Enzyme design. Structure first.
Site, mmCIF file in Angstrom:
data_model
loop_
_atom_site.group_PDB
_atom_site.id
_atom_site.type_symbol
_atom_site.label_atom_id
_atom_site.label_comp_id
_atom_site.label_asym_id
_atom_site.label_seq_id
_atom_site.Cartn_x
_atom_site.Cartn_y
_atom_site.Cartn_z
ATOM 1 N N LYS A 128 2.820 -3.736 7.150
ATOM 2 C CA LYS A 128 2.844 -3.929 5.702
ATOM 3 C C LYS A 128 4.248 -3.528 5.237
ATOM 4 O O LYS A 128 4.838 -4.178 4.378
ATOM 5 C CB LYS A 128 1.806 -3.040 4.994
ATOM 6 C CG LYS A 128 0.370 -3.511 5.133
ATOM 7 C CD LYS A 128 0.123 -4.868 4.459
ATOM 8 C CE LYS A 128 0.320 -4.809 2.942
ATOM 9 N NZ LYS A 128 0.017 -6.121 2.283
ATOM 10 N N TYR A 131 -0.962 -1.057 10.998
ATOM 11 C CA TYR A 131 -1.313 -1.661 9.722
ATOM 12 C C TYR A 131 -0.238 -1.354 8.683
ATOM 13 O O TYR A 131 0.328 -2.266 8.091
ATOM 14 C CB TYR A 131 -2.659 -1.129 9.213
ATOM 15 C CG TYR A 131 -2.866 -1.356 7.722
ATOM 16 C CD1 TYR A 131 -2.851 -2.645 7.183
ATOM 17 C CD2 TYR A 131 -3.024 -0.279 6.848
ATOM 18 C CE1 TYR A 131 -2.980 -2.857 5.809
ATOM 19 C CE2 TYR A 131 -3.158 -0.479 5.466
ATOM 20 C CZ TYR A 131 -3.132 -1.768 4.956
ATOM 21 O OH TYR A 131 -3.247 -1.968 3.598
ATOM 22 N N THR A 156 0.741 -1.266 0.000
ATOM 23 C CA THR A 156 0.000 0.000 0.000
ATOM 24 C C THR A 156 0.774 1.322 0.000
ATOM 25 O O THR A 156 1.911 1.395 0.459
ATOM 26 C CB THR A 156 -0.921 0.035 1.227
ATOM 27 O OG1 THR A 156 -1.544 1.313 1.327
ATOM 28 C CG2 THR A 156 -0.107 -0.218 2.497
ATOM 29 N N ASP A 157 0.118 2.381 -0.470
ATOM 30 C CA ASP A 157 0.740 3.702 -0.497
ATOM 31 C C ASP A 157 0.892 4.251 0.919
ATOM 32 O O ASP A 157 1.620 5.215 1.144
ATOM 33 C CB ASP A 157 -0.083 4.679 -1.364
ATOM 34 C CG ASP A 157 -1.508 4.887 -0.853
ATOM 35 O OD1 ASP A 157 -2.017 4.036 -0.098
ATOM 36 O OD2 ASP A 157 -2.132 5.905 -1.230
ATOM 37 N N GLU A 158 0.220 3.623 1.877
ATOM 38 C CA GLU A 158 0.305 4.077 3.260
ATOM 39 C C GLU A 158 1.680 3.865 3.875
ATOM 40 O O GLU A 158 2.027 4.522 4.862
ATOM 41 C CB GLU A 158 -0.776 3.395 4.119
ATOM 42 C CG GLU A 158 -2.184 3.877 3.800
ATOM 43 C CD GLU A 158 -3.246 3.300 4.730
ATOM 44 O OE1 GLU A 158 -3.069 3.370 5.965
ATOM 45 O OE2 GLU A 158 -4.264 2.786 4.224
#
Ligand SMILES: NC(=O)c1ccc[n+]([C@@H]2O[C@H](COP(=O)([O-])OP(=O)(O)OC[C@H]3O[C@@H](n4cnc5c(N)ncnc54)[C@H](O)[C@@H]3O)[C@@H](O)[C@H]2O)c1
Ligand SMILES: NC(=O)c1ccc[n+]([C@@H]2O[C@H](COP(=O)([O-])OP(=O)(O)OC[C@H]3O[C@@H](n4cnc5c(N)ncnc54)[C@H](O)[C@@H]3O)[C@@H](O)[C@H]2O)c1
Lengths: 329, 325
Positions: free
Chosen positions: B155, B151, B127-129
């Protein structure tokens, strides 16, 4: 006055840190939690064992029940505990996931669950960035670990960054180059070279860089980061002394008042072809950290220590290390 | 690459299901094995219509289950890793399940690959997070990560393990990092599905905090197309950012949906909540466009219309997923 929990304190850098800390801060206290595994050596701190300001706790940082109790009572936490043997990480990575990743996770959980205000310093490595032919990596560059060891160290860094922001912790991360100095195990380049040279043994050099940082200077940087480092920030630590093994060896011999006859260049060997380089301008600019010793001064101090402490390294050397022709088997 | 057999992890999820349907639809001689633990985000109804297809097979299990997943990994030609605990708020409340699924789960899958099928084509979906917040500009694959929640941190930790393992055991693996997906099969709790459902009921629209949070919106099908491209043509040891270039604030997204549905912007009422959520996420997806020639097939305008339509025409799906809240 500050109570510190130092993980992996029975190791090379941990021991140097603890001795330095107790020496510079009369009123500080240290609790050393070490599992006594690969790299540990009780002899490193035997003369401090009974100092009232020091307490040793045998255990795994991955042991939540034990660790939470220690975190609850300290003002700061300096995290040095880790499994760092590359080849060993390639054979059995489980060992590294557990100590490096799970261990750091457990420490982070104990901190946010029991004492979110504790000052936490996570010690990491220049290897997280992978190699670089030209230039140097800044704390803003991506990571590119090439081994399970560096990948697990990298993974632990990420958890620290995340937990710090999630639970508003007071935590910083440090990344340093190669350490050398007192208490480093005998098979590492610099110690091996000093020992063998003092015994008139041939110093092999396979096929004619790495940054070398005197351990006390690394220690001084950690101290600085502990007391003045900003939370959520990573701090690279490097001396800007990038040299090849031949260069290191030539300087060690010179400083040992010897000649270079001991240098035996043999045929080349695998996987020693990569350059690692850290840009440590951030810590210089923000915390005013500068190396206190030049490479020459650090090597000289390292030479003196090993010659006067044969009692320490002697039990650790085997036969590969004292062998006349180790490059043959 | 024809006749390719795939192990899709987390296939019972939002993106996983869309991916499986797309691939089986596009490649007549491919096969898919879907391993999913049926945890948060899971919904078997997503694939009820192809669950009996000969090329498809479902296996209930955790990717952290070495003995179970090792057998599946050994027999396939490719692995698309989508399974993960992906709820930000749940990660802050209880990060343990995130360490397990995201970090342990990926580690276990990586071990299965290196030990039982080092030559399998692996695509790790992320993810871009992981890059964290960014006021202006966008992050490239060469920028540091700065996860702000358990989270995204786990990741990010998983990404690192993948990079290290790939170089250590010479694997054929790439990583993908995409932006906010939206489209068919996304749970009602999410922004877009929630707005459409609320709006279709004349109910007021709950926006969070001030709704100024900026996110790139990527139609799920364009995301899976990107995944397919990376699987078949992506380079090992490479990370590929995936973004649509459709950055909007949450408020902007809601107003667009309302307009297209025929409702008034008076239904909008900000509700306050903003712990571990970040102001703006933005990815530079030049790499994948340049090397693999990937570009969105649908603009946000076209994508949101396809989405609005799907939800109004498939109430049968979100009906039992809607709680009291
Ligand atoms: N030595 C270097 O040049 C260097 C360079 C860069 C980074 N580092 C990092 O600095 C830190 C200290 O390394 P070191 O060189 O002193 O190594 P070391 O191997 O000498 O000692 C590691 C110590 O940590 C302990 N330990 C390991 N796993 C543990 C666990 N799960 N619980 C409790 N204790 C555990 C060991 O028993 C040992 O005493 C490590 O995190 C390492 O990655 C070292
Ligand atoms: N939805 C988005 O906007 C978005 C954006 C960027 C990245 N992603 C990534 O895409 C992937 C898929 O996410 P999603 O949005 O479809 O979420 P989701 O929550 O809808 O589904 C996750 C699926 O994985 C399964 N799962 C979770 N842990 C598992 C485990 N240990 N073993 C087996 N299955 C497990 C669940 O049961 C579920 O079916 C994730 O890796 C996520 O990080 C999603």
């Amino acid at each position: 006055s500050m109570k510190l929990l130092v993980t992996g304190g029975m190791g090379f850098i941990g021991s140097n840190f603890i001795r330095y800390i107790l020496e510079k801060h009369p009123d500080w206290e240290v609790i050393n939690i070490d599992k006594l595994g690969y790299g540990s050596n009780p002899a490193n701190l035997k003369d401090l064992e009974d100092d009232p300001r020091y307490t040793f706790v045998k255990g795994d940082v991955a042991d939540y029940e034990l660790v939470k109790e220690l975190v609850r009572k300290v003002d700061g936490v300096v995290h040095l505990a880790a499994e760092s043997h590359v080849d060993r990480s390639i054979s059995s990575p489980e060992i590294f996931l557990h100590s490096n990743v799970i261990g750091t996770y457990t420490l982070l959980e104990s901190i946010r669950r029991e004492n979110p205000e504790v000052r936490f310093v996570h010690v990491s490595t220049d290897e997280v960035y992978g190699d670089i032919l030209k230039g140097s990596f800044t704390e803003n560059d991506r990571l590119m670990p090439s081994s399970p060891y560096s990948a697990t160290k990298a993974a632990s860094d990420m958890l620290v960054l995340g937990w710090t922001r999630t639970y508003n912790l007071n935590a910083s991360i440090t990344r340093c180059t190669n350490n050398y100095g007192p208490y480093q195990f005998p098979e590492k380049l610099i110690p091996k070279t000093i020992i063998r040279a003092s015994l008139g043994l041939k110093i092999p050099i396979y096929g004619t860089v790495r940054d070398w940082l005197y351990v006390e200077d690394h220690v001084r940087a950690i101290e600085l980061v502990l007391l003045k480092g900003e939370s959520r920030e990573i701090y690279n630590i490097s001396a800007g002394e990038e040299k090849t093994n031949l260069e290191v060896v030539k300087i060690i011999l010179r400083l040992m008042g010897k000649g270079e006859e001991l240098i035996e260049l043999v045929e080349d060997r695998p996987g020693h072809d990569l350059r690692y380089s850290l840009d440590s301008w951030k810590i210089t600019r923000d915390l005013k950290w500068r190396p206190k010793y030049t490479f020459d001064e650090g090597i000289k101090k390292t030479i003196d220590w090993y010659l006067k402490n044969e009692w320490w390294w002697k039990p650790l050397v085997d036969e590969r290390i004292l062998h006349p022709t180790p490059w043959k088997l």
